[PDB]
Design a protein around this ligand. Structure first.
Ligand SMILES: [Cu+2]
Lengths: 235, 130, 50
DNA sequence: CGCCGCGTCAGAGGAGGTTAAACCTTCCAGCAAGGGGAAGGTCAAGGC
DNA sequence: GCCTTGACCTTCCCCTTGCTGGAAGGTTTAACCTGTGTGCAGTCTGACGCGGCG
């Protein structure tokens, strides 16, 4: 029964071979198609096997073409929405002599403009890194982009000098206070600690601790020490 | 059964039905191997009660008590009528306080000139100013 | 850049536009500006260059 | 055996076209109208 | 400068009704239908290898 009906499969497939994916994988999917068609065939309906099997095949391939054929998995319902939409817009540009407006075919499609607009934002495929933006083979597209993620050297020096300035300022103030602030803010360590953690590591105090770091600011506001850090107000 | 058929009979939807089910207010219908909520006649009429009870005004919990009585063959009609007339009393007091509302509303309204003026007495008397 | 002729020169020398070498020799300048104390740090130095 | 034949390798931005629906399932977001409680700070005010 | 001491703000998270909407994901229809290809690509080309074929 499998070998009987393979030419049916290639016929269906090459109707569906509109250039989405490729031939053979589609064909193989038609073959699993035919297998499960025969796997549960009632024969006393009198009908010919062909048609029953045929629509099961159609479902198999039109599913798999949806699941695959993109770098980006778009699940099925978005796909069929797109298909519906384009079938509509063809008619709209028959009749208007023009491409249609989103509002128009949307209200005909009975749904608001936002979803249409997002569908349109989403629909188009990627663009092949090695495409020749150069008219000849003088340039590929992969040359003219940048790593806008990594670092910058001047910024590294900026941070380093800032840190030097900061702990230079710290050493001018009392040891306990500066250290308590290092753990309060995680300077020169891996971690960060807070009111009660740092306190009860030292001792119970809560509100006067707040006032202690306040007077630390007071001794630090101090228009003699800011000027090594006044530059970093721009920071 | 199938589920949409039952919900279009009774007017509900599978979503509301499943809310009620998660509230434990009816018999749990079994599933199938596929997973369809296997409804029955018991589920049908229990659902009809759980529907019409909140229509009457017996809440989620109280309509659920009506249901577990619907399962109970010992059920006290006495109790049932106490529940009834208790809810009658709450609806009465609801009506009465809403009447107090509408009374004060119309007291405020009829005093207002309604002469497109900024000196609306209602506005300034709703605030504790002046 | 484009070339042209320096006839008054001594052949161990070359012509040069300013701004080219200015941006080329930039961080050198930043460093010794910090050294002299005009620009305390790097951002200020860069602004003075600009 | 010595051709004759064949094969591999050298040298300014920009895209395009169509091919299902009907029934099901789980699970998260969201409303009016707030209410409770963690957990850290923060306003005055003390006692050495 | 050490202890609080009480009282106050702010933010985050969680919790109560009665559902509703939406995404993401699954399984079946009986008239029927049986062998691409489908537009390439215009053959660069000289040495050197190597396989069959004498
Ligand atoms: Cu008025």
């Amino acid at each position: 029964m499998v070998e009987a009906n393979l030419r049916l499969v290639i016929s269906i497939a090459k109707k569906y071979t509109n250039r989405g994916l490729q031939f053979l994988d589609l064909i193989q999917e038609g073959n699993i198609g035919l297998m499960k068609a025969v796997d549960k065939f009632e024969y006393r309906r009198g009908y010919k096997f062909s048609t029953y099997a045929t629509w099961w095949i159609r479902q198999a391939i039109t599913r798999s073409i949806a699941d695959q054929a993109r770098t980006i998995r778009i699940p099925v319902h978005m796909i069929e929405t797109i298909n519906k939409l384009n079938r509509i817009s063809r008619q709209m540009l028959q009749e208007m002599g023009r491409e249609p407006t989103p509002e128009e075919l949307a209200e005909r499609m009975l749904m608001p403009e936002d979803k249409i607009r997002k569908v349109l934002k989403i629909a188009k495929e990627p663009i092949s890194m090695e495409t020749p933006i150069g008219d000849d083979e003088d340039s590929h597209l992969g040359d003219f982009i940048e790593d806008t993620t990594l670092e910058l050297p001047l910024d590294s020096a900026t941070t380093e000098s800032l840190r030097a300035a900061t702990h230079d300022v710290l050493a001018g103030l009392t040891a306990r206070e500066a250290k308590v602030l290092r753990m309060r803010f995680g300077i020169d360590m891996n971690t960060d600690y807070t009111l009660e953690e740092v306190g009860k590591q030292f001792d119970v105090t809560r509100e006067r601790i707040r006032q202690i770091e306040a007077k630390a600011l007071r001794k630090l506001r101090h228009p003699s020490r800011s000027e090594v850090l006044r530059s970093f107000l721009d920071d | 059964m199938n589920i949409s058929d039952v919900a279009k009979i009774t007017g509900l939807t599978s979503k509301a039905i499943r809310f009620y089910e998660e509230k434990g207010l009816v018999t749990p219908p079994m599933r199938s191997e596929n997973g369809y909520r296997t409804y029955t006649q018991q589920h049908l009429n229990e659902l009809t009660l759980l529907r019409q009870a909140r229509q009457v005004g017996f809440n989620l919990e109280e309509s659920g008590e009506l249901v577990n009585l619907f399962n109970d063959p010992q059920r006290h009609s006495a109790d049932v009528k106490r529940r009834t007339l208790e809810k009658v009393a709450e609806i009465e007091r609801h009506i009465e306080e809403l009447q107090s509302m509408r009374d004060q509303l119309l007291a405020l309204a009829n005093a207002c000139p309604g002469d497109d003026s900024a000196d609306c007495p209602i506005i300034e008397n709703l605030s504790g100013c002046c | 850049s484009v070339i042209t002729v320096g006839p008054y020169l001594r052949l161990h020398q070359c012509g040069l536009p300013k701004k080219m070498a200015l941006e080329l020799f930039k961080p050198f300048i930043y460093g010794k500006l910090e050294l002299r104390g005009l620009a305390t740090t790097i951002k200020a130095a860069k602004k003075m260059v600009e």
